Each structure stands twice: as structure tokens, then as C-alpha cells.
Amino acid sequence: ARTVVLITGCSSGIGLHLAVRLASDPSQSFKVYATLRDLKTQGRLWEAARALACPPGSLETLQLDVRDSKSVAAARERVTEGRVDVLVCNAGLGLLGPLEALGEDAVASVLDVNVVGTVRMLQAFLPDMKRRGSGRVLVTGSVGGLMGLPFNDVYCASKFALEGLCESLAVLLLPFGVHLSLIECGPVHTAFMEKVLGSPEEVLDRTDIHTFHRFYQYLAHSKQVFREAAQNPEEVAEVFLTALRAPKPTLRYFTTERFLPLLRMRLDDPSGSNYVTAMHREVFG
Amino acid sequence: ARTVVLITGCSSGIGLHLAVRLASDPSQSFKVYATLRDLKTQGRLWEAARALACPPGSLETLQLDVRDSKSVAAARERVTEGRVDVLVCNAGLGLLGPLEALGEDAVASVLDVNVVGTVRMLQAFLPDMKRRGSGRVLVTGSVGGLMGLPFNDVYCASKFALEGLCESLAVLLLPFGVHLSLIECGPVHTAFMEKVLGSPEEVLDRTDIHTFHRFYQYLAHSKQVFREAAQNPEEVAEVFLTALRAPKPTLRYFTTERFLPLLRMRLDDPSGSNYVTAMHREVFG
Ligand SMILES: NC(=O)c1ccc[n+]([C@@H]2O[C@H](COP(=O)([O-])OP(=O)(O)OC[C@H]3O[C@@H](n4cnc5c(N)ncnc54)[C@H](OP(=O)(O)O)[C@@H]3O)[C@@H](O)[C@H]2O)c1
Ligand SMILES: NC(=O)c1ccc[n+]([C@@H]2O[C@H](COP(=O)([O-])OP(=O)(O)OC[C@H]3O[C@@H](n4cnc5c(N)ncnc54)[C@H](OP(=O)(O)O)[C@@H]3O)[C@@H](O)[C@H]2O)c1
Ligand SMILES: C[C@]12CC[C@@H]3c4ccc(O)cc4CC[C@H]3[C@@H]1CC[C@@H]2O
Ligand SMILES: C[C@]12CC[C@@H]3c4ccc(O)cc4CC[C@H]3[C@@H]1CC[C@@H]2O
């Protein structure tokens, strides 16, 4: 159908549920290109798509690895319509542990995927939206890009980076009639975390005993935050559709109002210490 | 002298003036290791140091390239005292132009220096401060890390990343008695900008005519913002000393109160659109 939507990172979580929520839409107005780093993992996407009854042709899958600009351009070339009306930059990776225990590859990967990957997506797809004078870009955001979290130093570094990247682009884009919005998400049940790490044996080798202990405490605490605040990817998908529907989309959309008070205490105390003291008390006690 | 201070990026600007402001301090309590990417450029540092009368031994220069962990560890090994009381992460690069005109090397460099470089500094020097139960880390910040600026997409991406990185570390660090603060700076007369770019011929080749035109407009506008708001590096150095003096340093220190209203409109309108509309009007008219 008429609105062409291209989504990154659709093998699971937000991306997967958003592709099927769009392709199974009552109005049948979306033509979805669900992109995945590795096409062989598309099984779960179709199982969900078939549970929602997506009309043949409403959903097509492509291989798109955000670390490779040749993969990104190849995917763009497979959009048969020759246009993308809604570009959703969703692919992302986590990175957890003491800063000193993180290796150079892991740090570099996180920045390459979460930041440079988005830049690649935007360089390949913004030109044509500017030429056409229209387009929507939706970026999966995180409360981790709005407030720092202990033992997520590089991950927060990467999520804050998208905030800077998208805000800077948004200031330029108004006059071109291209809208950019971030969908700010808290914890989401998606297996994002399941790969965020483990291996206490190796970690203890890379840091001191006190840091290690504080790490275990952070891990106990995020086990409760996840049970307390994870949302399901279906709920998050609805926030994207809210954004793609608005005639004049705002820069930010929040999927929960839950972390706002905490967010407000970084501003109402500009020195930023109130936040630091409050987050240390919530995490470590 | 007694407080050992190690500073990155001292061939010019903030780093240069901060090293000499500390080594020429009346109390003569600072022993400064002024680090530079390339030792052969140390001329300007000494000229200023000799204009301020720094006692022999108050200032030592080392080579330290933040993109190389071997250079970073080698520099740490030359601290004869075996300790660093104040670590100042100042090295940084700019990147300007239409997002689509930026090459992969340039983007990668900016992130490698501004973000990963700080991570390298922190991995090499935090362990010993945690072991000792004391230390101050001061990071040169930017209003560009707090609000997005058109045509500085990757630069803002990198400066926001430091915000995330330092806030996340700050939450962990309290209990270790190690303080981390960011020194938020606006435009500074330092030649940072002088290398931020030019070459309209090559740029026009990489983007569309409308974007190009908007770029020229941004360039006219930053010529006035720089004359209107640049501060001198001596003024910025005093803010670092304010931070290193406080018995309980806050996470953020601002060198000007000038951009706060703008900063406040990103929060008081959480959708973040008020800011986007206001920044577009200030830059493009
Ligand atoms: N999960 C949370 O609690 C949470 C909270 C806030 C924000 N977010 C954000 O939500 C987004 C979606 O993640 P999720 O929570 O749904 O986790 P997820 O279930 O692990 O899904 C992330 C997707 O990104 C893909 N991806 C990873 N590397 C890629 C690459 N190089 N090229 C293309 N795609 C790649 C993954 O594919 P593969 O499976 O093949 O690797 C997967 O399809 C991320 O940007 C993110 O960080 C998540
Ligand atoms: N200038 C502004 O208007 C402004 C505004 C806000 C924030 N800041 C920030 O202020 C900091 C200091 O910059 P500045 O304004 O003083 O500009 P600058 O005069 O160009 O000084 C930056 C210094 O960083 C060094 N550097 C660059 N790459 C390095 C590397 N790979 N390893 C070690 N050192 C390296 C440069 O050395 P080389 O000369 O050899 O390259 C130079 O000594 C930066 O983090 C920054 O982005 C500046
Ligand atoms: C930033 C994340 C969402 C917000 C989460 C949060 C939010 C508030 C809080 O007090 C603790 C945590 C712990 C884990 C955080 C997450 C780590 C991954 C995710 O992106
Ligand atoms: C972010 C910077 C400081 C703040 C500057 C600013 C701040 C406010 C504003 O309205 C325009 C500009 C243009 C250039 C910006 C700068 C680019 C380099 C510097 O780091």
C-alpha cells in the first residue's frame, strides 16, 4: 500500500512488533519493508505477522546490516516504489559492566551500530525525502539517552549521541517538510537485555572487588526495574503510530510518564547533582 | 608541588591556558603535566607559561595522543609521583557541514577522539583514584552536548555522548570519593573553529543546492555568534579551578549563563519542539 515504511532491526522486539502492527493495520495503508541484520532469523517476525493476518504484499523483508553502507544502499535499491515515506531507525545494542572491564571492540561496536549506523541510514535516505519535500523519520529512543545509568556508561554515551544527532538534524529539517521524532522508551521486554551480558568470572578479572560488588548490586537492582517497568513491544509500537499519524510531529514522544520526575530533577537542579544523588540512592540503596 | 594535575590537549586553547593558570598559581600547590598530541607543537604553551612566570618544575609536558591506549599508558607511567589528583579530559575535535557531505573517516575520528578517547583516559586513570579513595576528574563540556545545533550533527552527537558517559560514571563514583564534573563552555576563542572546516566547492558536490544555501546561512550566523559570545580561554580556565577547589564538586559548572533560557526550553516543553522552533528562528531567520 501507499505509505512506504522501512524499519531497521526487525528480527525481534520493537522493530518486529512495529512492522506487523503496521502491516496488519485496519486501513491497510502501509507497505512495510522489515529489515534485519541477518535474514535467516526472520522466523519470529513471520510467526507474529501470521498471527495478525497481514495481507500478502503488506510486508517484505530485506537484509540490512547498519554497520555496512553497501548493505544499506543495496536495501534502499530494493524499495520498488522508489520512495520511503516513513524511515524507522530502530537497530541498537546494549553494553553493560564496569567501564574498565569493557574491551575496545565492544565499545567501538556499540558506537558503530547505535550512532554511526543511524548516520548511515540518514545519509542514504534523507536526500530523497528532501528532494520530495516530505518524509517522516522515527528513531527508537531510550530514557538512557536522557539520563545516565551506572554501568551503562558507553551505552548511555551512545543513546545520548542519538539525542544530539536527531535534535541537530531536526533544526535543519523543518523547512524541508521532513519530520524527525524520537520515541523515548524505558525498559522493554525484548531480549535486548538477555544479551546485554554476564560472565562474573571474567569481569572480576577486569576490575577491583568494590566495583565488582557495586556491579552485582546494580544487577540486582535492574532485575527489579525490569520486572517493575518493562513494557511490551506492542505498547511501544502504538507510540510510533501515534507519531507517524500526527500532522505536525514533535521531536519527542514518551512511552511512559514514569521516569519524568527523575528527568525533571536534572534541569530544576542545573548543577546536575540532585539527579546524581537520587539515582545513586535508587540503585545502590 | 602537591596536587598532581594531568591535562589533555594542551597545544592551544582551554588546555593551554588551564595548564599555565595552574602552574603559575600564587599558592604554587599544583604540579602540572601538560599533555599534547604532538610534542613539537609545545611552543605556544611555553611562550604563555613564560609570560606567567611558572616556577621550574611546576609544569612538565608529555606526548599523549588520546586515540592510542599505548600512548595514554606511556604518559601515565611518566607521572613520577605515581598518582594523579586532578585528571582533566579536554582534548576534542569539531566537525561541521551537511550530514550527507561528511565522510566515514571524519565521523569516525570525531567519535574516536571526543568519546572513545575520554573512555581511554578514564580506563587508564580511574583505577588508581578508586584504589586511593580520592581524585577529581574534570571534563571540558560544551553547550553543544546539551542542545543540538544544525550542521553539527556528529559533533553534537559526540558532545552529548560525553554527557551520558560522565553522568553514568558520576552515579557510581560518589562512594569511592572520586568527583567528576563537566565544565560547560559556549564558543571560546581558540582556533577550534578555524579547523572546523571550509571548502564550499567540495561540499556543494556532496549535498543539494537548498541544503548548501542553508549551510551558508548557518555559517553567516555562527560568524556572529562567535563574535557575540566567544569567551577567552583564561575565563574558561577559572571555571575549572572553581571546580577543582570545591570540597563537594557538582556534576556541572557553566562558564556563561547566556544559553540557559534556551536550555530551559527543552525541558519546560518536553516534546522538545519549542526548542527546535526557537533554534531554527535564531539560526536561519
Ligand atoms: N530493550 C530495552 O529494554 C530498551 C530500552 C530503551 C531503548 N531500547 C532501544 O530499542 C531498540 C530496539 O531494541 P530491542 O529493545 O527491541 O532489542 P532486541 O530485541 O535485541 O532488538 C534489536 C534489533 O536490532 C538488531 N540489530 C543489531 N545489530 C544490528 C545491525 N548491525 N544491523 C541491523 N540490525 C541490527 C537486532 O538483530 P539481531 O538480532 O540479529 O542482532 C534486533 O533485530 C534499540 O535501538 C534500543 O537500544 C530498548
Ligand atoms: N572552541 C570552542 O568554541 C568550544 C566550545 C565548546 C566546547 N569546546 C571544547 O573545548 C575542548 C578544547 O578545545 P579548544 O576549544 O581549546 O580547541 P583547540 O584550541 O583546537 O584545542 C584542542 C586541543 O585538543 C588537541 N587534540 C586534538 N586531537 C587530539 C588527540 N588525538 N590527542 C590529544 N589531543 C588532541 C589539539 O591538539 P592538536 O592541536 O595537535 O590537534 C589541541 O591541543 C574540546 O574538547 C572541545 O570540543 C570548545
Ligand atoms: C536505559 C534503559 C532504560 C531505563 C532503565 C532504568 C530506568 C530508571 C532506573 O531507575 C533504572 C533503570 C535501569 C536500567 C535502564 C535501562 C538499561 C537499558 C535501557 O535502555
Ligand atoms: C557547540 C558550540 C558552542 C555553542 C554555539 C552556539 C550556541 C548558541 C547558538 O544560538 C548558536 C551557536 C552556534 C555555534 C555553537 C558551537 C559550535 C562549536 C561549539 O562547541
Side-chain angles (χ1 to χ4, degrees):
Chain A
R2 288 306 79 190
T3 308
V4 174
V5 179
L6 187 144
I7 309 169
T8 71
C10 298
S11 77
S12 62
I14 310 337
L16 175 155
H17 299 255
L18 177 65
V20 297
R21 169 71 176 83
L22 294 167
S24 77
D25 185 77
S27 77
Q28 24 227 306
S29 54
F30 304 108
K31 154 72 184 298
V32 186
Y33 285 90
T35 79
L36 299 82
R37 185 194 64 192
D38 178 4
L39 264 198
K40 96 196 153 179
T41 59
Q42 65 188 134
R44 285 183 55 265
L45 202 206
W46 297 103
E47 178 176 24
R50 310 223 35 258
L52 249 19
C54 299
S58 68
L59 176 71
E60 190 168 328
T61 55
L62 314 163
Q63 210 156 257
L64 191 172
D65 182 347
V66 302
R67 286 129 60 194
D68 189 356
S69 357
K70 300 184 164 169
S71 171
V72 175
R76 179 180 68 229
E77 239 67 80
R78 335 279 177 157
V79 181
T80 65
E81 294 86 349
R83 78 171 182 290
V84 173
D85 303 294
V86 180
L87 178 69
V88 179
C89 295
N90 167 74
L93 328 161
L95 189 51
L96 210 52
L99 182 82
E100 57 295 352
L102 309 180
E104 297 266 270
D105 286 356
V107 176
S109 271
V110 177
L111 296 169
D112 192 40
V113 172
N114 290 2
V115 182
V116 185
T118 300
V119 165
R120 295 187 188 89
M121 284 313 288
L122 295 155
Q123 294 180 136
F125 292 91
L126 240 342
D128 197 70
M129 314 191 164
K130 281 155 145 202
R131 210 74 124 220
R132 303 168 181 274
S134 84
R136 282 150 188 269
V137 179
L138 299 172
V139 180
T140 303
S142 173
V143 321
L146 306 176
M147 76 179 201
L149 311 157
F151 301 111
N152 288 84
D153 311 292
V154 181
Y155 173 65
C156 294
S158 83
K159 291 316 188 172
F160 278 68
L162 286 191
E163 292 284 320
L165 176 88
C166 302
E167 197 159 280
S168 299
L169 290 163
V171 176
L172 176 57
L173 302 175
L174 331 51
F176 295 83
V178 169
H179 300 124
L180 191 160
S181 297
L182 287 129
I183 316 299
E184 321 277 24
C185 297
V188 190
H189 289 111
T190 55
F192 178 55
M193 202 71 27
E194 92 181 17
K195 355 184 272 170
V196 196
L197 234 72
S199 91
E201 324 95 17
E202 35 114 356
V203 173
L204 210 214
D205 222 47
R206 292 146 200 57
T207 196
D208 69 274
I209 193 47
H210 312 280
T211 292
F212 183 77
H213 173 250
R214 290 306 176 160
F215 187 38
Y216 170 94
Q217 285 187 290
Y218 158 81
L219 300 179
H221 170 80
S222 94
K223 252 168 144 273
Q224 186 77 181
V225 163
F226 201 62
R227 274 69 231 49
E228 287 187 350
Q231 281 176 120
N232 281 109
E234 310 87 49
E235 290 173 74
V236 174
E238 229 39 77
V239 188
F240 283 80
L241 229 202
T242 306
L244 85 78
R245 277 189 288 244
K248 226 324 235 79
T250 55
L251 177 61
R252 290 181 190 94
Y253 281 89
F254 298 84
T255 69
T256 182
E257 292 344 290
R258 203 167 191 148
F259 299 102
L260 271 42
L262 221 33
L263 275 297
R264 189 149 260 79
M265 94 171 72
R266 287 179 77 264
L267 340 160
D268 294 1
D269 152 57
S271 83
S273 86
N274 278 173
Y275 176 72
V276 167
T277 303
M279 187 61 187
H280 178 90
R281 170 159 103 52
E282 161 87 34
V283 170
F284 301 100
Chain B
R2 288 306 79 190
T3 308
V4 174
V5 179
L6 187 144
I7 309 169
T8 71
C10 298
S11 77
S12 62
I14 310 337
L16 175 155
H17 299 255
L18 177 65
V20 297
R21 169 71 176 83
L22 294 167
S24 77
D25 185 77
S27 77
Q28 24 227 306
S29 54
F30 304 108
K31 154 72 184 298
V32 186
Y33 285 90
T35 79
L36 299 82
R37 185 194 64 192
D38 178 4
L39 264 198
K40 96 196 153 179
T41 59
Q42 65 188 134
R44 285 183 55 265
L45 202 206
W46 297 103
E47 178 176 24
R50 310 223 35 258
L52 249 19
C54 299
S58 68
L59 176 71
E60 190 168 328
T61 55
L62 314 163
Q63 210 156 257
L64 191 172
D65 182 347
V66 302
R67 286 129 60 194
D68 189 356
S69 357
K70 300 184 164 169
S71 171
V72 175
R76 179 180 68 229
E77 239 67 80
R78 335 279 177 157
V79 181
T80 65
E81 294 86 349
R83 78 171 182 290
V84 173
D85 303 294
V86 180
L87 178 69
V88 179
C89 295
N90 167 74
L93 328 161
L95 189 51
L96 210 52
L99 182 82
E100 57 295 352
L102 309 180
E104 297 266 270
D105 286 356
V107 176
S109 271
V110 177
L111 296 169
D112 192 40
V113 172
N114 290 2
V115 182
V116 185
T118 300
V119 165
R120 295 187 188 89
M121 284 313 288
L122 295 155
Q123 294 180 136
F125 292 91
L126 240 342
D128 197 70
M129 314 191 164
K130 281 155 145 202
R131 210 74 124 220
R132 303 168 181 274
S134 84
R136 282 150 188 269
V137 179
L138 299 172
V139 180
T140 303
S142 173
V143 321
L146 306 176
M147 76 179 201
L149 311 157
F151 301 111
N152 288 84
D153 311 292
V154 181
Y155 173 65
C156 294
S158 83
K159 291 316 188 172
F160 278 68
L162 286 191
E163 292 284 320
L165 176 88
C166 302
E167 197 159 280
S168 299
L169 290 163
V171 176
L172 176 57
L173 302 175
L174 331 51
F176 295 83
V178 169
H179 300 124
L180 191 160
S181 297
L182 287 129
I183 316 299
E184 321 277 24
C185 297
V188 190
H189 289 111
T190 55
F192 178 55
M193 202 71 27
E194 92 181 17
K195 355 184 272 170
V196 196
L197 234 72
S199 91
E201 324 95 17
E202 35 114 356
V203 173
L204 210 214
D205 222 47
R206 292 146 200 57
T207 196
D208 69 274
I209 193 47
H210 312 280
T211 292
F212 183 77
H213 173 250
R214 290 306 176 160
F215 187 38
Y216 170 94
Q217 285 187 290
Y218 158 81
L219 300 179
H221 170 80
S222 94
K223 252 168 144 273
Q224 186 77 181
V225 163
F226 201 62
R227 274 69 231 49
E228 287 187 350
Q231 281 176 120
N232 281 109
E234 310 87 49
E235 290 173 74
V236 174
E238 229 39 77
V239 188
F240 283 80
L241 229 202
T242 306
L244 85 78
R245 277 189 288 244
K248 226 324 235 79
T250 55
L251 177 61
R252 290 181 190 94
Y253 281 89
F254 298 84
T255 69
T256 182
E257 292 344 290
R258 203 167 191 148
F259 299 102
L260 271 42
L262 221 33
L263 275 297
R264 189 149 260 79
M265 94 171 72
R266 287 179 77 264
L267 340 160
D268 294 1
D269 152 57
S271 83
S273 86
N274 278 173
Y275 176 72
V276 167
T277 303
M279 187 61 187
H280 178 90
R281 170 159 103 52
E282 161 87 34
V283 170
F284 301 100

